[PDB]
Design a protein around this ligand. Structure first.
Ligand SMILES: Nc1ncnc2c1ncn2[C@@H]1O[C@H](COP(=O)(O)OP(=O)(O)OP(=O)(O)O)[C@@H](O)[C@H]1O
Lengths: 52, 247, 48, 366, 100, 252
DNA sequence: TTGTATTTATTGCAATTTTCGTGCCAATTTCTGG
DNA sequence: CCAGAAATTGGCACGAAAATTGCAATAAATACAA
DNA sequence: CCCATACTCTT
DNA sequence: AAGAGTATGGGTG
């Protein structure tokens, strides 16, 4: 019946596999650059080619 | 913000101040609307755990089959659907205060699940093989009579002596007759400020009426009566006619 | 004649009105210098 | 580096206010009035707002009116006008009485200006009690005036957009490439990544491993995004090829499904990729979504893009008789002779989208 | 929108356009002084919102005036001479005018 | 405006303009202070109960073995935080009286000059309202925008200016350091980030005075605030002692 | 000889909303015979 | 000249089609241990 | 070219 | 243990 329980069962589970790296396609160049700047701030091992 | 003018309430305040250095669990008992939550939060505020978390938990709102998972947490792979490890309320309230509200509504099969944690402070997570030790101070509140429930048999005798190291009993409002008028004025001022009315007191007959009604909802019923009278006021003083719901 | 912003306008108006008299003020380059020195972390200010 | 100061319309107006014998109250009122003037030369607020902004109750509205009248005669003449009629009357008041058609033009502007806005020439001629020749002369005199006197001092520079895709014609073939001056790119810090060894602490090792994996994933994502954009742009350019050779009127109708099938992707990906992306072509700069359009059926089983039909409508309207403009029934007939099967209501919608008035509001006396 | 080189500038008089040809470019052999127009050019300024006053202006004075603004090339003040040569460079793919 | 620096940074004018004010105040060689500031060597802040003085310089291996031997009996640091702690812990009056006694007793020529120099610096600091730790920067001022404008060029390009570039570099370094300190990154990375932040602040204040100079695309060093202030092309000699004027002309 | 932990390789389906063309008709403008 | 008649226009409607957005974690190849 | 400071040989 | 001499770095033009 309708209830909330913790149990050991054998089930066939569905497969979601998307929404990963999909939001970068609709971003324009400027918003993409802002996202890349945030990622550079948050990750030590990411660097951007510099002109200085 | 709180009114303590009856001698019994001042004795209770002295008791609370005398146990500010303790860590033993406390058991608060009384009727409904007497101020058990107020006393619990005042006990938490005056102790050494002032800045520590105060987790207030209603033990009657936890489903029967997931009681252990809620209280202790589980490890990854413990059951079907456990995708990541998760802690419980004893780890969440670690270093602070856990306030079990309405401990008398717990069933006999659920009271036996927290017999070792309250005294020892050590437990195992669901699917975990390492013993977790926590430092939590336990406050419990009830509106029943536990000392009679244990005699009847509806409350486990092993849990009453674990919880009731210190016992506090709050008298009903009908015996704290030195608090009725100060509380009435406090609530009247608060609700007049909230609703932007222009009432600023009671008549010499409304005060007499407020001191004879046997408040059975206690302070909550008094608060509701004062709020209702403020909402439907018409002048600058509240007369006996407005308080016709009393008697 | 160079960088008193209000003084330039007042002088031009007075010359058009036929009143050859100036009302000197503070040059703007000195204010720029004060801001530049303050941007170096040094407290420099005018007194009284 | 430093630029140079530029004089705007308000700077010129304040320069003239400075050299005008005003009083202190009049000078403050003039300052507020000049503050309330836009770049076209018109007053943007009612005089009540100016009177309230002055900040004292000793001043009446007629003083503001007098100051405004004095200001309106500054250079350029007609600046700070309340509306178009006021500007035209102010400009006319500076003309000598020897002007041939001054009186009739003044009468038309003062009384009947909405009729001239509706291109009546019938009720206006009846009310003015005048013939066509003198009416035409008065209208020509009116149209010689300056409707935007504040544009004499023009300031500002146009804004531009950096294209993401370049389309050219190399060796007779239309070629597509990405804009190398704006393509995003990243790298991996080798100095930081050279210390991912078990010799150091395990916490440092796990930190550096996780960050390195995330960096590589992000680089791969950027590369895939660029490749997808290039492929979609190339397919779009290959499908719409008569546009780049002969401009509009040769657009083909297409939807996202065509490109999605051509590149073997989902139309959601095609929709997301072509959002706010620009393409540079010899014909100009176009958004990638400009090449998708609806269609109307054409006799012979074909279809005609709504862009081509809009261009044809514009070209047909631009080459009509000024005395007898084409209605929508006429434009529908002139399109049916070319095989286009479009309704009257759709033609009206297309004309409205081009910001073109109806036929009765386009006729001229000449 | 693209800038247009044209002889139809709405905010200038007929006399000031007398030395320009049908393409908006000055004739060969014209005597010019400071302030004269050499090449007539307009810059787009159109907007998608039409206020009632803007509608009245467009109805009375035409739609071309409300869409473009003057950005012509003028002789610098203090300069005079005779036009002896004109050259036109056009990007490949753009249609050529009469002068070219 | 202002910028809240993630970690303290030293002012290059009070370190590199000879004689070094920080060095003369702390009585330390410039080489050791430079080693400490740019994360090359340690320095003891509190000696403790062991045989460690209050300004001894410790190398990496020396600090490691000191930790393995004594443990938490002392305190050693590197960077501008250590220098700031040393500056904040000194008492001016006791140093003044002790050095005056030493000068009165001892007789020499060079040492007397050194003691006189130190006495003058200490008394100048005491008489004025300044404090030594103010020579270490915690907050960074930001110039008004209209004094550092952007260059508009044909085609919509805005280019950039040297001052804006230096400010952007400082801001990027500060943001990265804040993020790394928030996530508790390994020390081997945060020390490098702090050193780079110190270098960026030095470049912003006085580019080229300390070691190398940051250059642009055409290999030209960027102009800093000091370049704006000093020189024949600076404010004093180009805009204040002489200027261009109206109502003037020239001819043959 | 195999069974298992690790590292690359994954840029679509399905609701929901918005836009399309074209008809009905009232309000508005224009045309024509007595 | 006038009043009836005809033509024009755009707001609202309606069904259909096209475009936009929410969902968030798996599957397979590869190298290593008994 | 000229001066101030740290390091090295000598009485 | 001081004192004179030499090498290095900063500033100017
Ligand atoms: N001394 C007091 N001063 C002011 N308000 C009070 C006082 N005592 C009680 N109240 C008010 O009475 C109301 C009811 O109190 P409380 O919630 O503590 O009662 P309870 O039924 O015993 O508690 P609970 O069921 O939540 O454990 C609250 O709104 C509280 O603010």
């Amino acid at each position: 019946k309708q209830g909330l329980q913790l149990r050991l069962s054998q089930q066939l589970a569905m497969t979601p596999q998307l929404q990963q790296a999909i939001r970068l396609l609709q971003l324009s160049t400027l918003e993409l650059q802002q996202e890349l700047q945030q990622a550079l701030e948050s990750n030590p091992l990411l660097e951007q080619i510099d002109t200085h | 913000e709180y009114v303590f003018e009856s001698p019994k309430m001042k004795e209770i305040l002295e008791k609370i101040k005398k146990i500010s250095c303790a860590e033993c669990p406390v058991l608060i008992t009384g009727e409904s609307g007497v101020g058990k939550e107020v006393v619990a939060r005042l006990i938490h505020k005056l102790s050494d755990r002032s800045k520590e978390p105060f987790v207030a938990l209603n033990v009657a709102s936890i489903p029967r089959d997931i009681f252990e998972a809620e209280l202790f947490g589980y490890e990854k792979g413990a059951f079907t659907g456990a995708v990541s490890s998760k802690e419980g309320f004893f780890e969440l309230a670690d270093g602070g205060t856990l306030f079990l509200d309405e401990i008398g509504e717990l069933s006999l099969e659920a009271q036996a699940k927290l017999l070792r944690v309250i005294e020892s402070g050590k437990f195992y997570r669901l699917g975990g093989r390492k013993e977790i030790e926590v430092n939590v101070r336990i406050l419990a509140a009830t509106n029943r009579n536990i000392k009679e429930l244990v005699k009847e048999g509806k409350f486990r005798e092993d849990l009453y002596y674990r919880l009731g190291v210190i016992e506090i009993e709050i008298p009903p409002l009908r015996e704290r007759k030195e608090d009725i008028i100060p509380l009435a004025n406090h609530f009247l001022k608060k609700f007049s400020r909230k609703y932007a009315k222009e009432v600023e007191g009671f008549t010499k007959s409304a005060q007499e009426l407020l001191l004879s009604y046997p408040w059975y909802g206690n302070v909550r019923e008094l608060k509701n009566v004062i709020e209702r009278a403020v909402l439907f006021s018409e002048g600058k003083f509240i007369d006996r006619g407005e308080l016709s719901c009393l008697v | 004649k160079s960088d008193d912003v209000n003084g330039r306008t007042k002088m031009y108006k007075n010359i058009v009105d036929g009143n050859h008299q100036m009302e000197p003020g503070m040059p703007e380059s000195f204010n720029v210098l004060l801001k530049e020195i303050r941007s170096l972390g040094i407290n420099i200010e005018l007194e009284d | 580096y430093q630029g140079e100061t530029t004089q705007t319309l308000q700077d010129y107006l304040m320069w003239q206010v400075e050299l005008t014998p005003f009083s202190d109250t009049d000078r403050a009122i003039a300052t507020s009035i000049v503050d309330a003037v836009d770049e076209t030369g018109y007053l943007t607020v009612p005089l009540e707002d100016i009177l309230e902004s002055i900040g004292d109750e000793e001043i009446d509205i007629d003083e503001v009116e007098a100051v405004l009248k004095r200001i309106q005669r500054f250079d350029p003449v007609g600046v700070a006008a309340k509306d178009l009629r006021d500007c035209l009357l102010i400009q006319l008041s500076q003309f000598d009485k020897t002007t041939p058609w001054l009186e009739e033009a003044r009468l038309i502007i003062s009384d009947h200006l909405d009729l001239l806005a509706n291109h009546d020439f019938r009720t206006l001629m009846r009310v003015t009690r005048l013939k066509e020749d003198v009416l035409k002369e008065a209208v020509n005199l009116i149209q010689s005036l300056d409707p935007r006197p504040g544009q004499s001092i023009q300031t500002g520079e146009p804004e531009y957009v950096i294209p993401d895709v370049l389309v050219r014609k190399h060796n007779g073939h239309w070629t597509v490439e990405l804009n190398s001056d704006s393509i995003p790119r990243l790298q991996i810090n080798q100095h930081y990544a050279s210390m991912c060894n078990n010799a150091r602490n395990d916490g440092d090792s796990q930190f550096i491993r996780s960050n390195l994996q995330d960096a590589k994933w992000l680089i791969k994502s950027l590369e895939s995004r660029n490749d997808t954009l290039l492929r979609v742009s190339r397919c779009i350019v290959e499908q719409q090829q008569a546009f780049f050779e002969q401009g509009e009127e040769y657009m083909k109708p297409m939807v996202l499904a065509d490109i999605a099938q051509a590149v073997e992707m989902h139309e959601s990906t095609i929709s997301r990729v072509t959002t706010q992306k620009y393409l540079h072509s010899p014909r100009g700069i176009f958004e990638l979504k400009y090449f998708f359009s609806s269609h109307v059926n054409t006799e012979g089983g074909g279809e005609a893009s709504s862009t081509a039909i809009r261009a044809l409508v514009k070209k047909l309207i631009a080459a009509e008789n000024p005395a007898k403009p084409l209605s929508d029934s006429k434009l529908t007939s002139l399109l049916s002779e070319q095989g286009i099967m479009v309704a009257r209501r759709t033609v009206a919608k297309y004309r409205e989208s081009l910001s073109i008035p109806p036929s009765n509001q386009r006729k001229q006396l000449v | 929108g693209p800038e247009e080189i044209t002889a139809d500038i709405p905010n200038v008089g007929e006399a000031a356009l007398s030395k320009l040809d049908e393409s908006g470019i000055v004739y060969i052999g014209a005597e010019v002084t400071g302030g004269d127009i050499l090449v007539g050019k307009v810059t787009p300024k159109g907007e998608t919102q039409l206020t009632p006053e803007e509608k009245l202006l467009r109805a009375i004075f035409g739609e071309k005036a409300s869409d473009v603004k003057d950005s012509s090339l003028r002789v610098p003040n203090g300069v005079s001479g005779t036009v002896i040569d004109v050259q036109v460079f056009t990007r490949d793919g753009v249609e050529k005018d009469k002068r070219a | 405006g202002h910028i809240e620096l993630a970690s303290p940074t030293a002012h290059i004018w009070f370190l590199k303009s000879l004689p070094s004010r920080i060095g003369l105040l702390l009585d330390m060689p410039l080489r050791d202070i430079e080693r400490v500031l740019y994360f090359e060597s340690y320095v003891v802040i509190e000696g403790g109960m062991t045989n460690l003085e209050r300004q001894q310089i410790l190398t990496e291996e020396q600090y490691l073995d000191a930790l393995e031997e004594f443990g938490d009996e002392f305190d050693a640091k590197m960077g501008a935080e250590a220098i700031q702690a040393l500056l904040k812990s000194m008492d001016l009056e006791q140093e003044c009286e002790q050095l005056r006694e030493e000068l009165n007793e001892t007789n020499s020529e060079t040492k007397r000059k050194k003691l006189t120099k130190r006495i003058k610096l200490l008394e100048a600091f005491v008489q004025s309202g300044n404090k030594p730790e103010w020579m270490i920067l915690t907050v960074l001022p930001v110039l008004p925008p209209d004094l550092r404008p952007l260059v508009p060029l044909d085609g919509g390009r805005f280019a950039t200016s040297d001052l804006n570039d230096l400010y952007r570099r400082v801001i990027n370094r500060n943001n990265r350091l804040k993020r790394l300190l928030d996530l508790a990154a390994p020390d081997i990375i945060v020390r490098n980030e702090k050193r780079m932040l110190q270098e960026a602040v030095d470049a912003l204040l006085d580019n080229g005075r300390r070691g190398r100079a940051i250059t642009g695309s055409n290999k030209r060093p960027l102009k800093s605030l000091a370049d704006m202030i000093k020189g024949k092309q600076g404010r004093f000699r180009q805009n204040l002692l002489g200027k261009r004027v109206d109502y003037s002309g020239r001819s043959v």
